[PDB]
Amino acid sequence: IVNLQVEMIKQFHMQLNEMHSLLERYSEGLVAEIERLREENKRLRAHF
């Protein structure tokens, strides 16, 4: 039971860290979109 508990705690910790990492990965795009639209508007204004 003690071995099971220790292994379970380690696995829980690892799984928590993996879930945190996955949420961080799945939750820069906005900045790039803003930059692209700014570039597009500046190009439009200069061309006009």
Place this chain on the structure above:
Amino acid sequence: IRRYTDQRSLDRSFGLVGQSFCAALHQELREYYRLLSVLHSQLQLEDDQGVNLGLESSLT
């Protein structure tokens, strides 16, 4: 340019080469007048928009 064009358009003695040169000068003047008209139309657009937009695009 217009004085030159008027002076040479009336001079038949310029010959075919002179007439061709005057025609080229007049054509360049036509391109220039097209450019000036475009600039005037842009100024008219700036006047029509009425806003002293402190945007980098405003015609200052």
